[PDB]
Amino acid sequence: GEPSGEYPTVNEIPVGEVRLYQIADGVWSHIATQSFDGAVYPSNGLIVRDGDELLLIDTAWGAKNTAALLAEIEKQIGLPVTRAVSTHFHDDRVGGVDVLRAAGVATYASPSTRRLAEAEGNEIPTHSLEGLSSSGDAVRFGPVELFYPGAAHSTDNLVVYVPSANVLYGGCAVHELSSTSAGNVADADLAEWPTSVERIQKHYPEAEVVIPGHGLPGGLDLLQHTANVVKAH
């Protein structure tokens, strides 16, 4: 089906296609779908205008989807993606890095993410981002801040803030409001996750939009909700 302006869901995105959703001036999410344990899930990433170029946050979960992402960006926006950052080592964040690299996109991740991706047999971003190794650490990268809040969904997970727009992209460390479960916790630190979310809340108290790794964006309450969901689990 067609979203007709609504935030798109799995019912509007067949596996292999990508949609964009404008969040603010020069900020979009990208939404794709793919399969885990035989079920199809939506997944979000971010696109941020960087002058006459675009910065991509996270792949669209695989090679076919990521090629579709590049085509959708060219259709909708018409500016080149020149850099990408992956926010943790799982396939919904690095799967498609080989497609990006061949298309001339410089791919980046923390050294922790790169080592974990390598060990998992996943695709590996080309460049290492120093300065993100301890909880609370951050760096500026083009038009965004990259922040390591501590272990949560994974030990390496990063969040991304767009200061110009007060948009916080939480990746998989943040759940959508309808979420009832902590999701895939195989690599999570459930005991630390609420503390890590608290660090995000303290560091980005002026966030107006919070985008989860999967599902619908909302306001600041996605952070508290996530802590609640994880504590419950």
Residues with a catalytic annotation lie at 88, 90, 92, 153, 184
Select 26 or 87, whichever has its Cβ closest to Zn ion. 87
* CA atoms within 13 A of residue 178's CA, in its CB half-sphere: 5
Q: Rule CB under 5 A: which of 26-85 touch Zn ion?
A: 62
What is the number of other CB atoms lying within 10 angstroms of the CB of residue 39? 7
- Check: CB of residue 138 under 8 Å from CB of residue 79: no
Q: Is 186 helix (H, G, I), strand (E, B) or coil?
A: coil
Q: Does 90 bind Zn ion (CB under 5 A)?
A: yes
| DSSP-derived 3-state class of residue 84 | strand
Beta-strand ranges (E) seen in 62-202 are: 81-85, 106-109, 127-128, 138-141, 144-147, 159-162, 167-171
Rg over alpha carbons for the chain, rounded to the nearest Å, is 16
187 labelled binding-site residue: no
Pick out residues in 135-174 that bind Zn ion (CB under 5 A): 172
Residue 123 within binding range of Zn ion, rule CB under 5 A: no
Residue with smaller CB distance to Zn ion, 72 or 156: 156
- In the complex, minimum distance from the CB of residue 53 to Zn ion, in angstroms, rounded to a whole number: 26
Which stretch, 16-24, 88-96, 195-203, 224-232, contacts Zn ion (CB under 5 A)? 88-96
Q: Is 175 annotated as a binding residue?
A: no
Any contact of residue 94 with Zn ion (CB under 5 A)?
no
What proportions of the chain, in percent to the nearest 5, are helix, strand and coil? 25, 30, 45
130 known member of a binding site: yes
Grouping H, G, I as helix, E, B as strand and the rest as coil, residue 216 is coil
Binding residues: 88, 90, 92, 128, 130, 153, 172, 214
Q: Which residues are annotated as a binding site for Zn(2+)?
A: 88, 90, 92, 128, 130, 153, 172, 214
Where along the sequence are the contacts to Zn ion (CB under 5 A)?
62, 90, 92, 95, 172, 213
